[PDB]
Design an enzyme around this catalytic site. Structure first.
Site, PDB file in Angstrom:
ATOM      1  N   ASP A 177       0.825  -1.154  -0.006  1.00  0.00           N
ATOM      2  CA  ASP A 177       0.020   0.002   0.107  1.00  0.00           C
ATOM      3  C   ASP A 177       0.663   1.264   0.012  1.00  0.00           C
ATOM      4  O   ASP A 177       1.467   1.583   1.185  1.00  0.00           O
ATOM      5  CB  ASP A 177      -0.752   0.181   1.149  1.00  0.00           C
ATOM      6  CG  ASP A 177      -1.810   1.087   1.387  1.00  0.00           C
ATOM      7  OD1 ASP A 177      -1.881   1.895   0.301  1.00  0.00           O
ATOM      8  OD2 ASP A 177      -2.569   1.187   2.433  1.00  0.00           O
TER       9      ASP A 177
ATOM     10  N   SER B 168      -0.638  15.738 -11.850  1.00  0.00           N
ATOM     11  CA  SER B 168      -1.019  15.447 -13.172  1.00  0.00           C
ATOM     12  C   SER B 168      -1.103  16.670 -14.277  1.00  0.00           C
ATOM     13  O   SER B 168      -1.919  17.579 -13.629  1.00  0.00           O
ATOM     14  CB  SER B 168      -2.186  14.377 -13.482  1.00  0.00           C
ATOM     15  OG  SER B 168      -2.735  14.005 -14.579  1.00  0.00           O
TER      16      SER B 168
END
Ligand code: NA
Length: 330
Positions: A35, A199
């Site tokens: 994770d 992004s």
């Protein structure tokens, strides 16, 4: 040193991926959920409340000659999905894919929430976010990666998740055979303890690319792609009959649909998520309503590039003094 381990989807939907991890001496192999959005290595154990264990493999520290109680240390964690676990702490030898760390904090669960008990395939978590998020008290502990780092050939790990197929976690090296083209690196903020990046925009299907900054985290422990409501609405508007269902808890679409791809930007590069990756199948067994793999992050307080996004890429988690992320097509 290096390590290389295969990671395997737990079910036909890629809800999560498990990676075998050796703990203790002799080795006890547990299948952990790696994770990148958390920082605790915790396991089902011989200490876990018996009614909360249903098929998981447990770590038994009393059977490990290298286990030592980390006296006074406790831990307690709550995840984004509402799940939780807590317990006490041992140090032990932990190996992943041939890479060994001695003295790793192994957080032994005394209590786990119902979602963990109900998932027989996941024996615990191995956190790979920054050690500043580790929950051990009163002495915070390091992640497996942070303890391995100085021994690694390069201070990196890579995630290469499969679509309905096994993939690979590598530590300490880039496998240049595992991706196509070049790797585009992007800046990381560690301010919230995550692999947080920005992004450069998105496209839906064959549509034009929208240049827009989207801050989010690279999180292998989250199944879906959670993005701002504007972006998510633009995606699902291209699927006839898709709608947001408050009753189901997100966007659903007709199972008869063919889904468009979704592209996200990494600097000037582009990662394309095929439409098929966004199908999470019937909302309930036999339903003709299917659950979408792109969902709104509104109310979660952060955008999450979970497995839907990451499995479309070869992803480099660069833990050099200035961390960065890298993405390549594959
Ligand atoms: Na679900």
């Amino acid at each position: 040193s290096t390590g290389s381990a295969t990671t395997t989807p737990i079910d036909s939907l890629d809800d999560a991926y498990i990676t075998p991890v050796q703990i203790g001496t002799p080795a006890q192999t547990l299948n952990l959920d790696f994770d990148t959005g958390s920082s605790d290595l915790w396991v089902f154990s011989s200490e876990t409340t018996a009614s909360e264990v249903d098929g998981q493999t447990i770590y038994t520290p009393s059977k490990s000659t290298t286990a030592k109680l980390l006296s006074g240390a406790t831990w307690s964690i709550s995840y984004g999905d509402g799940s939780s676990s807590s317990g006490d702490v041992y140090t032990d030898t932990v190996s992943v894919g041939g890479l060994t760390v001695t003295g790793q904090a192994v957080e032994s669960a005394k209590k786990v929430s119902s979602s963990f008990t109900e998932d027989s395939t996941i024996d615990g978590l191995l956190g790979l976010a920054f050690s500043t998020l580790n929950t051990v008290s009163p002495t915070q502990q390091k992640t497996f990666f942070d303890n391995a780092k100085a021994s690694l050939d390069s201070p990196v790990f890579t995630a290469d998740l499969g679509y309905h197929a096994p993939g690979t976690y590598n530590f300490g090296f880039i496998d240049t055979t595992a991706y196509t083209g070049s790797i585009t690196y992007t800046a990381v903020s560690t301010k919230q303890g995550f692999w947080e990046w920005t992004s450069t925009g998105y496209a839906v299907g064959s549509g034009t690319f929208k240049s827009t900054s989207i801050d989010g985290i690279a999180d292998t422990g989250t199944t879906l792609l959670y993005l701002p409501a504007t972006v998510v609405s633009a995606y699902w508007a291209q699927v006839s009959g898709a709608k947001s269902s408050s009753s189901v808890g997100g966007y659903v679409f007709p199972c008869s649909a063919t889904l468009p791809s979704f592209t996200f930007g990494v600097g000037s590069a582009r990662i394309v998520i095929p439409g098929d990756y966004i199908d999470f199948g019937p909302i309930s067994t036999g339903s003709s309503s299917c659950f979408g793999g792109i969902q709104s992050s509104a109310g979660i307080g952060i955008n999450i590039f979970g497995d839907v996004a990451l499995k479309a890429a070869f992803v480099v988690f660069n833990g050099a003094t200035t961390p960065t992320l890298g993405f390549a097509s594959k």
